């Protein structure tokens, strides 16, 4: 009824495609992103955590698109936006207009043919900028371009200064995205690193230390401004493909990659951790509710295995506002993976948020059995073990869960809290 035999699992999911290539590509990209994310030398695992569905595939050959105001004089826009940065009074519409107008400065050579969802972005050898990836339309409404009052600059900015300002502004996206309680020190260290990056050659110091955090405090929700998020994703896709003098700008935009895909990313990370192929691993997913979710993740046509696809930034680029890859969209898989993580004492899973709707109790049962199996055999053996024990956890599984959760400082709505409430109350 509840659990399904691995034979029936294999039979019912014989139609799956590009599983291994998708897993490998997503995992390699995540590892590469760590250079811009955890590039800071501080890693304290106690740190921030990371209905119908619309698939992102573009079906009409139209590039992702936004609409902004009238193109500005870049020298004046620079002076205005910098004065706003220094005064912690930034106009988001102005900032988006400037970021789009500044895209022309970032030119590189495309190392290979670049096509995604049928859209030919570039041929090998083409000169390319972020504008090549998207359509930025502009109307005739002029921006505000106020000068706060601290701006005493008569000369024109250099391109190096432009690049430093673009980096700082886009870093406000990452700082806004960092949310939750007890994140002050983490954000302060991230901001310090960002300031360092954007005052070090080839960038140039254009603000004093602590300006970025002061401005962030007034821009706390910019990560959900659609045009700003869009521009952050555009810059990130560009620098992900094109090596460039100013690629360190990704320190602020790297968090757009695989945005709203935490279920898929958790799946591929879990597959890598247990050192199995996706085909072999799926057989351990006995529960009847997994099939729908696994098919949801491997829907064809979405380019999950294509390097540098629009897919990697689909959420930031507005290709879909209802991700079929989120933790909620595949809540059973997500809960299972993190109950296994809890069983293995992984702080990241203990602090993850339970998807309450997707049978967390049953998932913790299967999690105990799979955790035992992968702590240090086979799908059929585990299934038989579950049947022999009447679908219940063994006393040893519960002692293990409790020994982990009871000694952990459980956060609200977390897996650790669920485990304490269920097995240690």
Alpha-carbon span 56 to 323, nearest angstrom? 8
- Identify whether the C-beta of residue 115 lies closer than 8 Å to the C-beta of residue 95: no
Q: Which fold has domain 65-256?
A: Rhabdovirus nucleoprotein-like fold (1.10.3570)
As given in the structure block, the two tokens for residue 35 are 């250079």
**What are the distances in angstroms from CA 307 to CA 29, 302, 399?**
9, 12, 44
Q: How far apart are CA 401 and CA 144, in angstroms?
A: 57
**For residue 163, what are the contacts with CB-CB under 8 A and spacing of at least 6?**
105, 106, 202, 203, 245, 246, 249
Angle at alpha carbon of residue 318, lines to 81 and 223, rounded to 5°? 45
Of 337, 336, 348, the residue nearest 408 (C-alpha): 348
Nearest Cα residue to 200 out of 151, 253, 248: 248
How many CB atoms neighbour CB 29 within 10 A?
17
Q: Where are the beta strands (DSSP E) in 104-186?
A: 108-109, 114-116, 119-122, 127-128, 135-138
Residue 236 in contact with residue 308, Cβ under 8 Å? no
State the DSSP string of 259-276. Answer: TT-HHHHHHHHHHHHTT-
The answer to whether domain 6-47+259-423 and domain 65-256 are alike in fold is no
What does the alpha-carbon distance between residue 15 and residue 11 come to, in Å, rounded to a whole number? 9
**Listed residue (411, 409, 418, 297) closest to 367, CA to CA:** 418
* Domain residue ranges of the chain, discontinuous segments joined by +: 6-47+259-423, 65-256
Whether the CB-CB separation of 206 and 195 falls below 8 Å is answered with no
299 φ/ψ angles, rounded to the nearest 5 degrees: -50, 130
Separation between Cα atoms, residue 348 and residue 49, nearest integer Å: 7
Give the span between the Cα atoms of 264 and 327, in whole angstroms: 8
Give the resolution to one decimal, in Å.
2.1
CA–CA separation, 394 and 375 (whole Å) = 15
The whole-angstrom separation of Cα 240 and Cα 278 is 26
From residue 205, give the alpha-carbon distance in Å to each of 37, 80, 183, 195, 412.
22, 17, 26, 8, 41
Of the options 3.40.50.2000, 1.10.3720.10, 3.40.50.300, 1.10.3610.10, the CATH number for the domain spanning 6-47+259-423: 1.10.3610.10
């Amino acid at each position: 009824k509840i659990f399904v035999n691995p034979s029936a699992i294999r039979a019912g999911l014989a139609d799956l495609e590009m599983a291994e290539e998708t897993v490998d590509l997503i995992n390699r990209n995540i590892e590469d992103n760590q250079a811009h994310l955890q590039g800071e030398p501080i890693e304290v695992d106690e740190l921030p955590e990371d209905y119908e569905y619309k698939y992102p595939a573009i079906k009409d050959l139209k590039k992702p698109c936004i609409t902004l105001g009238k193109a500005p004089d870049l020298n004046k826009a620079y002076k205005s936006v910098l004065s706003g940065m220094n005064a912690a009074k930034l106009d988001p519409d102005d900032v988006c207009s400037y970021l789009a107008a500044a895209m022309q400065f970032f030119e590189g050579t495309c190392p290979e043919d670049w096509t995604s969802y049928g859209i030919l972005i570039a041929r090998k050898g083409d000169k390319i900028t972020p504008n090549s990836l998207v359509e930025i339309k502009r109307n005739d409404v002029e921006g505000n371009w106020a000068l706060t009052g601290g701006m005493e600059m008569t000369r024109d900015p250099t391109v190096s200064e432009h690049a430093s300002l673009v980096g700082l502004l886009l870093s406000l996206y990452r700082l806004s995205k960092i949310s939750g309680q007890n994140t002050g020190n983490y954000k302060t260290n991230i901001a310090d690193r960002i300031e360092q990056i954007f005052e070090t050659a080839p960038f140039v110091k254009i603000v004093e230390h602590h300006t970025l955090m002061t401005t962030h405090k007034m821009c706390a929700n910019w990560s959900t401004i659609p045009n700003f998020r869009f521009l952050a994703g555009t810059y990130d896709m560009f620098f992900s493909r094109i090596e460039h003098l100013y690629s360190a700008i990704r320190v602020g935009t790297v968090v757009t990659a695989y945005e709203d895909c935490s279920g898929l990313v958790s799946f591929t990370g879990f597959i890598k951790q247990i050192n199995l192929t996706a085909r072999e691993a799926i057989l351990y997913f006995f529960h009847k509710n997994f099939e729908e979710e696994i098919r949801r993740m491997f829907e064809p046509g979405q380019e999950t295995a294509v390097p540098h696809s629009y897919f990697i930034h689909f959420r930031s680029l507005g290709l879909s506002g209802k991700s079929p890859y989120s933790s909620n969209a595949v809540g059973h898989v997500f809960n299972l993976i993190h109950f296994v993580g809890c069983y293995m004492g992984q702080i990241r899973s203990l602090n993850a948020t339970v998807i309450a709707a997707c049978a967390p109790h049953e998932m913790s049962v299967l999690g105990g059995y799979l955790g035992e199996e992968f702590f240090g055999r086979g799908p059929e053996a585990v299934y038989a073990r579950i049947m022999m024990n009447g679908g219940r956890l063994k006393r040893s599984h519960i002692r293990r869960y409790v020994s982990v959760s009871s000694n952990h400082q459980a956060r609200p709505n977390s897996f650790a809290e669920f485990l304490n409430k269920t097995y240690s109350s």
